[PDB]
Design a protein around this ligand. Structure first.
Ligand SMILES: [Mg+2]
Ligand SMILES: [Mg+2]
Ligand SMILES: [Mg+2]
Ligand SMILES: [Mg+2]
Ligand SMILES: [Mg+2]
Ligand SMILES: [Mg+2]
Ligand SMILES: [Mg+2]
Ligand SMILES: [Mg+2]
Ligand SMILES: [Mg+2]
Ligand SMILES: [Mg+2]
Ligand SMILES: [Mg+2]
Ligand SMILES: [Mg+2]
Ligand SMILES: [Mg+2]
Ligand SMILES: [Mg+2]
Ligand SMILES: [Mg+2]
Ligand SMILES: [Mg+2]
Ligand SMILES: [Mg+2]
Ligand SMILES: [Mg+2]
Ligand SMILES: [Mg+2]
Ligand SMILES: [Mg+2]
Ligand SMILES: [Mg+2]
Ligand SMILES: [Mg+2]
Ligand SMILES: [Mg+2]
Ligand SMILES: [Mg+2]
Ligand SMILES: [Mg+2]
Ligand SMILES: [Mg+2]
Ligand SMILES: [Mg+2]
Ligand SMILES: [Mg+2]
Ligand SMILES: [Mg+2]
Ligand SMILES: [Zn+2]
Lengths: 136, 116, 66, 81, 52, 177
RNA sequence: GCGGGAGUGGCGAAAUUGGUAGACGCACCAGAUUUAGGUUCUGGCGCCGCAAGGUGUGCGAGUUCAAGUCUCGCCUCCCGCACCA
RNA sequence: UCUCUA
RNA sequence: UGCCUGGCGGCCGUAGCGCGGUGGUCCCACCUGACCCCAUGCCGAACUCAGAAGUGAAACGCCGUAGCGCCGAUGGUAGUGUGGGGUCUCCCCAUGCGAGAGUAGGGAACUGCCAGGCAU
RNA sequence: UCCUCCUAAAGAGUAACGGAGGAGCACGAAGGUUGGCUAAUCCUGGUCGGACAUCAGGAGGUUAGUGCAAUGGCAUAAGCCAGCUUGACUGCGAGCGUGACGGCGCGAGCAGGUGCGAAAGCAGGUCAUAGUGAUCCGGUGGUUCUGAAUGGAAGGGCCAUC
RNA sequence: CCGACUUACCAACCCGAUGCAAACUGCGAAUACCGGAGAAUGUUAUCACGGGAGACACACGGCGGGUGCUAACGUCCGUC
């Protein structure tokens, strides 16, 4: 499970998740899993889709993870009234805009990357798509 | 290095006279020569100037970089300033110590009639 | 230099066992008689000689004859 | 299930800093132009710097903001009026 | 608040005084300053006295 | 200034030959000699610093500048401002005369002297050596002293490289090896 | 669940104003006493080794020139409150 | 003065 | 008027670094010496003084050079004021403003006053 | 109660049992002025001497420093050394800022007298923003201002201060 | 004592590529705000003083946000 080792601050505002993404092009590898929807991916969802494509490739090829969960998410416990401070940090998310490349992959064929990224996208709440390395 | 530290050493009183609007006598000192010039409060144009590089001053002297040359320079620039009607200035040491040739120049200009 | 804070630094004569008479400025005051100077120090002959490894086979053949 | 607190309740009063008279704005002598902590601005012609780096007018006239110096620092001067 | 308070009495005979503080532990010697006395309109040496 | 005259007449001509310099100002020359005694034990008592400065004032006839800690470190139990060493800068004639008395008297008075190192020129011509024991100078009386000090010598020259200083000291017959 | 306190060698226990970490004692090891064991008596004793210094105060990061000795989080343990319909 | 046990 | 140099500015990197080259009549720099003016918590290193034997090595100045730094469009994109709309955690339409980053490209500053030197 | 940042929506201001940190002082020099200086860290060499004392050179260029929290400043240094000093002056104060108010703040300049500097000039506490407490009552010194028939006095007032 | 080399358990700096930030900024809008000039319009709509108040329990909706679960006809601010 991905998590920052150190943080400048322990808690963070809820913020918003509007705007387009930046990690749009397939930078490192040959095939990519691009986000189409909007939302937040936890560290569990990231690690589960990583497991599903590492097992689908039999550790063949190289897999990049373009995102990193750096936003802390607080929750208040059950049967706690709405005052008395901000809730306790429970888990970590990464804010995902449309166009964000989530994963990259090479060293494998295209059809194997399709079935691996499909097994990974079945572990993700947001709608994804398959992309390849574009020249320019 | 030495040039830069002299400029850093001079640029406080220069900016202070820059905001005082002071007509300022600028001394510049070399081991061989000594220079003087009276500068308008805008800092962009001069009024009078004197040196030991001028022939009319250097030919009456033994060496161009001693105290007697520096006093002859401060006398010449003061007599030119009083010729042009400039009487009250402010002495810019230009990062040198007020000592030796610089002091003998300013004492010559005080004695010849400038007021600072 | 300043005037008073420094020790006395006066020219004296230092002669050596090799007869190297040398006048130097020093804080000793009295005259000096040396033992070795840089002229007569065995840096150029003696330290070269003073390694002296010697041979083991040559020691063996030295100790007798067949 | 009662409990909690908040070690983080504090804050100080707003000091009402900023620029009191903007550019092209005629002032009297002694009029406060800028209150500020550091020298975010600097005093130019006919402008004094206070004890707390407050920029006040030494004369009467219009405020002129301008950028001078090798460091591109922001100077405030009073134009004549 | 160990820095106690004193007064700097004029040595001009007037009872005029400035009031101030000092650390009597680290500065045991008495404070003497040359200050302005508005009654005599001169600068006169003031000496440390008790704040009373 | 005996070695200064020997520099000015024969060393400059020699180095101009063995380097083929365009100008005579391009030659190396010695600039200063620095004599440090790092006395980290004077936090025990001032008198060790005060007496170590007295011995080095006899070596070079100058009053030493008592150096202090630039900052505070706790591994050595020192605070910023403690007098922790002494130095002497030697320039001019007093530099040359100390360098004469050094290479003529004191280096031969080293116990088991077998040469210096040519690997102590700090990459940029400046040579640094350290003596174990101050009694090699004859200024110090052996019965009169009690504590074996040690100092370090730093010859700062105007040579850019390391070899131009090595040739300069070798021109002064400096006993490298 | 809230609040208060503490965590140190094999053990109980100390250290102050942040300036080595183990004072002490117990237990253990060894020595001498004794036929022998116990006692009693003397001397050692936190971990790595040539003897020469380094690791070490619940876990992990900061502050400090430098922390058991501050500060935050985590952890376990102890105590008191957890009331009104 | 005290002095257990095999 | 041309060249060169020194001083004081304007402007504040298209003006700064780097690399190579180059300059000594004058100027500048280093330099020589220091009992003195003055100076070093030691030192004529610096500061200062008296000077002018030497050298342009360094520094400085000048020339060249696109390895950088820097500047930098056009178009588009993001955002957004008003009005309207939808599938309303977010977007779209009309209209107005319009970046940042990046690209092409530019680019090895320009200029004023005084003084001096050599030429004209 | 006070200070700093964010929330705070590019003037000011702006709430929550919202997110994070500090203050209830210090300094007779750690103030003023004149003169001068410029860091952190790392590399190499070097007696004891060691990851780390001091010394010399080089890279670097403020990544340091600021009496203390944070922010904004700081090379003309507001940072760091030394000399002389007491402007950590008294009476005022045009004109502005900020508050519902009480109040708080900045301030050129004027009069007197002073310190440093050759001089131009600077100085009415400290790089700034926290380091604080109304009134009443009472105490101390000064002052004929008042003084219950009159002369004093008590007491009160005013100024400084607790 | 010096060390001999080769691993695959890692890795500083630096270099290149790629992301994130309310308490980051070598950039930087739209709007808003302050000041000035100019028309047209508007029953002075503005300011000052004085007489009299009431009110200081707000609500939802849009936009920008904190908190909560971008839960609440929830809660707390800014603006309409
Ligand atoms: Mg301890
Ligand atoms: Mg039994
Ligand atoms: Mg028995
Ligand atoms: Mg050139
Ligand atoms: Mg010189
Ligand atoms: Mg050259
Ligand atoms: Mg455009
Ligand atoms: Mg652009
Ligand atoms: Mg350039
Ligand atoms: Mg160039
Ligand atoms: Mg605001
Ligand atoms: Mg706003
Ligand atoms: Mg201070
Ligand atoms: Mg100064
Ligand atoms: Mg070392
Ligand atoms: Mg100060
Ligand atoms: Mg401060
Ligand atoms: Mg009462
Ligand atoms: Mg009366
Ligand atoms: Mg009466
Ligand atoms: Mg931001
Ligand atoms: Mg109410
Ligand atoms: Mg209300
Ligand atoms: Mg409301
Ligand atoms: Mg809201
Ligand atoms: Mg809300
Ligand atoms: Mg709601
Ligand atoms: Mg409601
Ligand atoms: Mg609303
Ligand atoms: Zn001899």
């Amino acid at each position: 499970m991905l998590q920052p080792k150190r943080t400048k601050f322990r808690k963070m505002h809820k913020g918003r998740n509007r705007g387009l993404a930046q990690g749009t092009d397939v930078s490192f590898g040959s095939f990519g899993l691009k986000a189409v929807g909007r939302g937040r991916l936890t560290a569990r969802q990231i690690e589960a889709a990583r497991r599903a494509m590492t097992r689908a490739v039999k550790r063949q090829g190289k897999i990049w993870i373009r995102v990193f969960p750096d936003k802390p998410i607080t929750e208040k416990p059950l049967a706690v009234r709405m005052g008395k401070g901000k809730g306790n940090v429970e888990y970590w998310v990464a804010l995902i805009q449309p166009g964000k490349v989530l994963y990259e992959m090479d060293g494998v064929p295209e059809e194997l990357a399709r079935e691996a990224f499909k097994l990974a996208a079945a572990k993700l709440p947001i709608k994804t798509t398959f992309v390849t390395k574009t020249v320019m | 290095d030495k040039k830069s530290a002299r400029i850093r050493r001079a640029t406080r009183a220069r900016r202070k006279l820059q905001e005082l609007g002071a007509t300022r006598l600028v001394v510049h000192r070399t081991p061989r020569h000594i220079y003087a010039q009276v500068i308008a409060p805008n800092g962009s144009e001069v009024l009078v100037a004197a040196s030991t590089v001028e022939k009319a001053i250097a030919e009456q002297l033994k060496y161009t970089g001693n105290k007697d040359a520096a006093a002859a320079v401060g006398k010449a620039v003061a007599e030119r300033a009083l010729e042009k009607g400039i009487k009250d200035v402010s002495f810019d040491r230009s990062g040198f110590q007020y000592h030796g040739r610089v002091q003998a120049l300013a004492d010559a200009a005080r004695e010849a009639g400038l007021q600072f | 230099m300043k005037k008073d804070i420094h020790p006395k630094y006066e020219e004296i004569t230092a002669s050596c066992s090799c007869g190297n008479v040398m006048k130097i400025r020093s804080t000793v005051g009295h005259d000096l008689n040396l033992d070795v100077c840089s002229k007569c120090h065995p840096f150029f002959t003696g330290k070269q000689r003073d390694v002296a490894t010697g041979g083991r086979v040559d020691r063996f053949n030295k100790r007798f004859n067949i | 299930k009662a409990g909690g607190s908040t070690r983080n309740g504090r804050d100080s009063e707003a000091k009402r800093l900023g620029v009191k008279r903007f550019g092209g704005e005629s002032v009297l002598a002694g009029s406060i132009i800028v209150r500020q902590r550091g020298t975010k601005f600097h005093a130019g012609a006919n402008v004094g710097c206070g004890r707390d780096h407050t920029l006040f007018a030494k004369a009467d006239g219009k405020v002129k903001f301008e950028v001078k110096g090798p460091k591109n620092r922001k100077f405030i001067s009073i134009e004549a009026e | 608040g160990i820095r106690e308070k004193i007064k700097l009495v004029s040595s001009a005979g007037t009872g005029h005084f400035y009031t101030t503080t000092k650390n009597k532990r680290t500065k045991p010697e008495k404070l003497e300053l040359k200050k302005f006395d508005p009654v005599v309109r001169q600068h006169v040496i003031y000496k440390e006295a008790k704040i009373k | 200034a005996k070695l200064h005259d020997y520099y000015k007449d024969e060393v400059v001509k020699k180095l101009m030959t063995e380097f083929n310099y365009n100008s005579v100002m391009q030659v190396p020359r010695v600039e200063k000699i620095t004599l440090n005694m790092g006395v980290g034990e004077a936090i025990a008592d001032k008198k060790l610093l005060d007496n170590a400065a007295a011995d080095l004032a006899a070596i070079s006839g100058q009053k030493p500048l008592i150096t202090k800690a630039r900052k505070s470190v706790a591994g050595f139990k020192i605070r910023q401002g403690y007098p922790i060493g002494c130095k002497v800068t030697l320039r001019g004639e007093r530099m040359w005369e100390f360098f004469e008395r050094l290479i003529t008297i004191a280096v031969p008075r080293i116990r088991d002297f077998r040469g210096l190192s040519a690997k102590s020129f700090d990459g940029r011509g400046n040579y640094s050596m350290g003596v174990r024991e101050q009694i090699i100078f004859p200024e110090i009386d052996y019965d009169k002293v009690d504590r074996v000090r040690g100092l370090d010598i730093t010859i700062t020259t105007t040579a850019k490289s390391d070899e131009e200083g090595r040739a300069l000291l070798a021109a002064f017959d400096f006993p490298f090896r």
